Design a protein around this nucleic acid. Structure first.
Ligand code: MN
Ligand code: MN
Ligand code: MN
Lengths: 112, 116
DNA sequence: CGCTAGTGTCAGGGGAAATACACGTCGC
DNA sequence: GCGACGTGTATTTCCCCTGACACTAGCG
Protein backbone atom coordinates (compact mmCIF):
# COMPACT_ATOMS: atom_id res chain seq x y z
CA UNK A 1 0.00 0.00 0.00
CA UNK A 2 2.20 2.81 -1.31
CA UNK A 3 0.80 4.85 -4.21
CA UNK A 4 -2.39 2.78 -4.04
CA UNK A 5 -4.33 4.85 -1.50
CA UNK A 6 -3.54 8.15 -3.23
CA UNK A 7 -6.42 10.31 -4.40
CA UNK A 8 -7.21 10.85 -8.06
CA UNK A 9 -6.51 14.55 -7.54
CA UNK A 10 -3.15 13.79 -5.94
CA UNK A 11 -1.84 11.35 -8.56
CA UNK A 12 -2.80 13.91 -11.20
CA UNK A 13 -0.35 16.25 -9.48
CA UNK A 14 2.23 13.45 -9.63
CA UNK A 15 1.93 12.91 -13.38
CA UNK A 16 1.97 16.70 -13.72
CA UNK A 17 5.41 16.84 -12.10
CA UNK A 18 6.65 13.91 -14.19
CA UNK A 19 6.76 16.23 -17.20
CA UNK A 20 8.81 18.88 -15.35
CA UNK A 21 9.02 20.43 -11.90
CA UNK A 22 6.81 23.48 -11.37
CA UNK A 23 6.12 26.10 -8.74
CA UNK A 24 2.49 25.92 -7.61
CA UNK A 25 0.19 28.22 -9.55
CA UNK A 26 2.04 26.67 -12.49
CA UNK A 27 0.40 23.41 -11.40
CA UNK A 28 -3.00 25.04 -10.93
CA UNK A 29 -2.97 26.29 -14.52
CA UNK A 30 -2.13 22.90 -16.05
CA UNK A 31 -4.65 21.15 -13.79
CA UNK A 32 -7.24 23.76 -14.76
CA UNK A 33 -6.68 22.77 -18.39
CA UNK A 34 -7.04 19.01 -17.92
CA UNK A 35 -10.15 19.09 -15.72
CA UNK A 36 -11.82 21.92 -17.61
CA UNK A 37 -12.69 24.05 -14.57
CA UNK A 38 -11.17 26.40 -12.01
CA UNK A 39 -9.14 24.57 -9.39
CA UNK A 40 -9.15 26.42 -6.16
CA UNK A 41 -5.78 26.83 -4.55
CA UNK A 42 -7.48 26.06 -1.24
CA UNK A 43 -7.63 22.51 -2.62
CA UNK A 44 -4.26 22.41 -4.39
CA UNK A 45 -1.71 23.37 -1.72
CA UNK A 46 -2.98 21.21 1.18
CA UNK A 47 -2.89 18.03 -0.93
CA UNK A 48 0.62 18.93 -2.13
CA UNK A 49 1.91 19.12 1.44
CA UNK A 50 0.48 15.67 2.11
CA UNK A 51 2.67 14.14 -0.62
CA UNK A 52 5.84 15.84 0.67
CA UNK A 53 5.40 14.28 4.11
CA UNK A 54 4.90 10.88 2.45
CA UNK A 55 8.14 11.17 0.47
CA UNK A 56 6.82 11.57 -3.08
CA UNK A 57 7.34 15.33 -3.52
CA UNK A 58 10.06 17.76 -2.43
CA UNK A 59 9.04 21.35 -1.69
CA UNK A 60 12.24 23.23 -2.44
CA UNK A 61 12.35 27.03 -2.26
CA UNK A 62 12.74 29.36 -5.24
CA UNK A 63 11.86 32.91 -4.10
CA UNK A 64 10.90 34.55 -0.84
CA UNK A 65 7.32 33.86 -2.00
CA UNK A 66 7.59 31.11 -4.67
CA UNK A 67 8.18 27.40 -4.11
CA UNK A 68 9.33 24.73 -6.58
CA UNK A 69 7.83 21.26 -6.19
CA UNK A 70 9.35 18.16 -7.77
CA UNK A 71 9.19 14.39 -7.50
CA UNK A 72 11.37 12.44 -5.14
CA UNK A 73 12.37 9.20 -6.84
CA UNK A 74 10.11 7.47 -4.31
CA UNK A 75 7.38 9.64 -5.81
CA UNK A 76 8.65 8.94 -9.32
CA UNK A 77 8.33 5.19 -8.55
CA UNK A 78 4.71 5.86 -7.70
CA UNK A 79 4.13 7.30 -11.18
CA UNK A 80 5.82 4.45 -13.03
CA UNK A 81 4.34 1.61 -11.00
CA UNK A 82 0.63 2.32 -11.47
CA UNK A 83 1.42 3.27 -15.03
CA UNK A 84 2.69 -0.32 -15.34
CA UNK A 85 -0.50 -1.62 -13.74
CA UNK A 86 -2.67 0.14 -16.29
CA UNK A 87 -0.48 -0.96 -19.20
CA UNK A 88 -0.60 -4.42 -17.64
CA UNK A 89 -4.42 -4.43 -17.80
CA UNK A 90 -4.66 -2.48 -21.08
CA UNK A 91 -2.23 -4.39 -23.32
CA UNK A 92 -4.11 -7.69 -23.63
CA UNK A 93 -4.20 -8.02 -27.45
CA UNK A 94 -1.98 -7.46 -30.47
CA UNK A 95 -3.92 -4.43 -31.66
CA UNK A 96 -3.86 -2.88 -28.17
CA UNK A 97 -0.05 -2.97 -28.18
CA UNK A 98 0.03 -1.47 -31.68
CA UNK A 99 -2.16 1.29 -30.23
CA UNK A 100 0.02 2.01 -27.18
CA UNK A 101 3.18 2.35 -29.25
CA UNK A 102 1.57 4.46 -31.96
CA UNK A 103 0.50 6.67 -29.03
CA UNK A 104 4.05 6.86 -27.68
CA UNK A 105 5.55 7.42 -31.14
CA UNK A 106 3.47 10.58 -31.55
CA UNK A 107 4.20 11.72 -27.99
CA UNK A 108 7.94 11.63 -28.72
CA UNK A 109 7.50 13.19 -32.17
CA UNK A 110 6.18 16.38 -30.55
CA UNK A 111 9.10 16.35 -28.11
CA UNK A 112 11.72 18.80 -29.39
CA UNK B 1 -20.75 11.38 -26.17
CA UNK B 2 -17.15 12.26 -25.27
CA UNK B 3 -15.53 10.32 -22.43
CA UNK B 4 -13.33 13.22 -21.29
CA UNK B 5 -16.42 15.21 -20.29
CA UNK B 6 -17.20 12.49 -17.72
CA UNK B 7 -14.17 10.27 -17.13
CA UNK B 8 -11.94 13.11 -15.91
CA UNK B 9 -13.95 13.66 -12.70
CA UNK B 10 -14.05 10.06 -11.48
CA UNK B 11 -12.71 8.53 -8.28
CA UNK B 12 -9.41 6.69 -8.19
CA UNK B 13 -11.54 3.71 -7.14
CA UNK B 14 -13.81 4.19 -10.15
CA UNK B 15 -10.91 4.59 -12.58
CA UNK B 16 -9.41 1.31 -11.33
CA UNK B 17 -12.73 -0.42 -11.92
CA UNK B 18 -12.49 0.88 -15.49
CA UNK B 19 -8.93 -0.21 -16.26
CA UNK B 20 -9.83 -3.65 -14.89
CA UNK B 21 -12.76 -4.14 -17.25
CA UNK B 22 -10.59 -2.77 -20.06
CA UNK B 23 -8.76 -6.09 -19.80
CA UNK B 24 -11.93 -8.19 -20.08
CA UNK B 25 -15.55 -8.15 -18.97
CA UNK B 26 -16.09 -9.75 -15.57
CA UNK B 27 -18.78 -10.19 -12.94
CA UNK B 28 -19.07 -8.50 -9.57
CA UNK B 29 -16.76 -10.37 -7.23
CA UNK B 30 -14.28 -10.98 -10.05
CA UNK B 31 -13.68 -7.22 -10.01
CA UNK B 32 -13.58 -7.19 -6.20
CA UNK B 33 -10.89 -9.87 -6.11
CA UNK B 34 -8.70 -8.50 -8.90
CA UNK B 35 -8.96 -5.08 -7.22
CA UNK B 36 -7.88 -6.49 -3.86
CA UNK B 37 -4.74 -7.91 -5.50
CA UNK B 38 -3.94 -4.42 -6.77
CA UNK B 39 -4.61 -2.55 -3.51
CA UNK B 40 -3.52 -5.33 -1.13
CA UNK B 41 -6.31 -4.60 1.38
CA UNK B 42 -9.93 -5.77 1.50
CA UNK B 43 -12.59 -4.23 -0.75
CA UNK B 44 -16.02 -4.24 0.90
CA UNK B 45 -18.70 -4.99 -1.69
CA UNK B 46 -20.81 -2.41 0.15
CA UNK B 47 -18.46 0.05 -1.57
CA UNK B 48 -17.94 -1.80 -4.86
CA UNK B 49 -21.45 -2.49 -6.20
CA UNK B 50 -22.70 1.10 -5.67
CA UNK B 51 -19.62 2.49 -7.45
CA UNK B 52 -20.52 0.32 -10.44
CA UNK B 53 -24.11 1.57 -10.35
CA UNK B 54 -22.59 5.04 -10.70
CA UNK B 55 -20.58 4.09 -13.79
CA UNK B 56 -23.55 2.51 -15.59
CA UNK B 57 -25.72 5.64 -15.50
CA UNK B 58 -22.89 7.72 -16.96
CA UNK B 59 -22.83 5.24 -19.84
CA UNK B 60 -19.33 3.87 -19.28
CA UNK B 61 -20.16 0.43 -17.83
CA UNK B 62 -22.75 -2.06 -19.09
CA UNK B 63 -24.78 -4.31 -16.76
CA UNK B 64 -26.22 -7.56 -18.12
CA UNK B 65 -27.73 -10.72 -16.67
CA UNK B 66 -25.61 -13.84 -16.89
CA UNK B 67 -27.94 -15.48 -14.39
CA UNK B 68 -30.40 -13.87 -12.00
CA UNK B 69 -27.94 -13.98 -9.09
CA UNK B 70 -24.84 -13.02 -11.15
CA UNK B 71 -24.44 -9.98 -13.41
CA UNK B 72 -21.51 -9.55 -15.78
CA UNK B 73 -20.06 -6.04 -16.08
CA UNK B 74 -18.18 -4.69 -19.09
CA UNK B 75 -16.96 -1.39 -20.50
CA UNK B 76 -18.97 0.10 -23.33
CA UNK B 77 -17.61 2.34 -26.09
CA UNK B 78 -17.67 5.52 -24.01
CA UNK B 79 -16.15 3.45 -21.21
CA UNK B 80 -13.34 2.19 -23.42
CA UNK B 81 -12.52 5.71 -24.62
CA UNK B 82 -12.37 6.79 -20.97
CA UNK B 83 -9.60 4.24 -20.33
CA UNK B 84 -7.44 5.16 -23.32
CA UNK B 85 -8.00 8.91 -22.94
CA UNK B 86 -6.68 8.68 -19.38
CA UNK B 87 -3.79 6.63 -20.75
CA UNK B 88 -2.97 9.21 -23.43
CA UNK B 89 -2.72 11.91 -20.75
CA UNK B 90 -0.54 9.88 -18.37
CA UNK B 91 1.86 8.90 -21.16
CA UNK B 92 2.40 12.39 -22.52
CA UNK B 93 3.18 13.68 -19.02
CA UNK B 94 5.64 10.77 -18.64
CA UNK B 95 7.18 10.60 -22.14
CA UNK B 96 9.54 13.59 -21.87
CA UNK B 97 12.82 12.08 -23.13
CA UNK B 98 14.21 9.09 -24.96
CA UNK B 99 14.97 7.68 -21.51
CA UNK B 100 11.35 7.90 -20.35
CA UNK B 101 9.97 6.69 -23.69
CA UNK B 102 12.08 3.54 -23.88
CA UNK B 103 11.12 2.50 -20.35
CA UNK B 104 7.58 2.41 -21.78
CA UNK B 105 8.64 0.55 -24.92
CA UNK B 106 10.05 -2.26 -22.76
CA UNK B 107 7.15 -2.20 -20.29
CA UNK B 108 4.70 -3.15 -23.05
CA UNK B 109 7.16 -5.47 -24.79
CA UNK B 110 7.25 -7.43 -21.53
CA UNK B 111 3.47 -7.47 -21.04
CA UNK B 112 3.05 -8.61 -24.66
CA UNK B 113 5.48 -11.48 -24.14
CA UNK B 114 3.44 -12.46 -21.05
CA UNK B 115 0.44 -13.32 -23.27
CA UNK B 116 1.92 -16.70 -24.25
C1' DC C 1 -34.25 -28.21 1.84
C1' DG C 2 -29.22 -26.24 4.53
C1' DC C 3 -25.35 -23.35 2.64
C1' DT C 4 -22.97 -20.73 -0.13
C1' DA C 5 -22.51 -17.53 -3.72
C1' DG C 6 -23.98 -12.75 -5.50
C1' DT C 7 -25.85 -8.73 -5.13
C1' DG C 8 -28.86 -4.95 -2.86
C1' DT C 9 -28.76 -1.10 0.30
C1' DC C 10 -28.93 2.38 4.05
C1' DA C 11 -28.26 4.71 8.43
C1' DG C 12 -23.85 6.12 10.51
C1' DG C 13 -19.31 7.58 10.86
C1' DG C 14 -15.43 10.06 8.35
C1' DG C 15 -12.52 13.21 5.69
C1' DA C 16 -11.56 15.93 1.96
C1' DA C 17 -13.54 20.44 -0.85
C1' DA C 18 -15.64 24.67 -1.10
C1' DT C 19 -15.18 29.46 0.02
C1' DA C 20 -14.23 32.38 2.13
C1' DC C 21 -10.23 34.95 5.25
C1' DA C 22 -5.23 36.52 5.71
C1' DC C 23 -0.37 38.16 5.09
C1' DG C 24 4.37 38.76 3.03
C1' DT C 25 6.65 40.26 -1.61
C1' DC C 26 8.05 41.46 -6.35
C1' DG C 27 7.04 44.79 -9.56
C1' DC C 28 6.86 49.14 -11.13
C1' DG D 1 3.35 52.48 -1.86
C1' DC D 2 -0.01 50.36 -4.63
C1' DG D 3 -0.90 46.81 -7.61
C1' DA D 4 -1.03 41.92 -8.36
C1' DC D 5 1.59 37.79 -7.21
C1' DG D 6 2.15 33.59 -4.45
C1' DT D 7 0.88 30.98 -0.68
C1' DG D 8 -1.22 29.75 4.09
C1' DT D 9 -5.50 27.91 6.20
C1' DA D 10 -10.02 26.79 8.51
C1' DT D 11 -14.67 25.38 9.24
C1' DT D 12 -18.31 24.74 7.31
C1' DT D 13 -20.03 21.85 3.99
C1' DC D 14 -20.92 17.90 1.67
C1' DC D 15 -20.34 13.27 -0.12
C1' DC D 16 -18.37 8.94 -0.09
C1' DC D 17 -17.23 5.04 2.54
C1' DT D 18 -17.58 1.99 6.52
C1' DG D 19 -20.31 -1.64 8.64
C1' DA D 20 -24.67 -4.08 9.00
C1' DC D 21 -28.67 -6.15 7.80
C1' DA D 22 -31.09 -8.35 4.14
C1' DC D 23 -32.80 -11.36 0.36
C1' DT D 24 -32.60 -14.23 -3.66
C1' DA D 25 -30.74 -18.08 -6.07
C1' DG D 26 -27.90 -21.85 -7.30
C1' DC D 27 -25.59 -26.25 -5.55
C1' DG D 28 -26.18 -30.59 -3.14
MN1 MN E 1 -7.79 30.62 -6.75
MN1 MN F 1 -17.52 -8.02 1.96
MN1 MN G 1 -1.80 11.97 -28.34
Amino acid sequence: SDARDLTAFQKNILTVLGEEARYGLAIKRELEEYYGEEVNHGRLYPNLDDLVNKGLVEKSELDKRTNEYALTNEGFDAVVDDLEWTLSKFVADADRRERVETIVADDAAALE
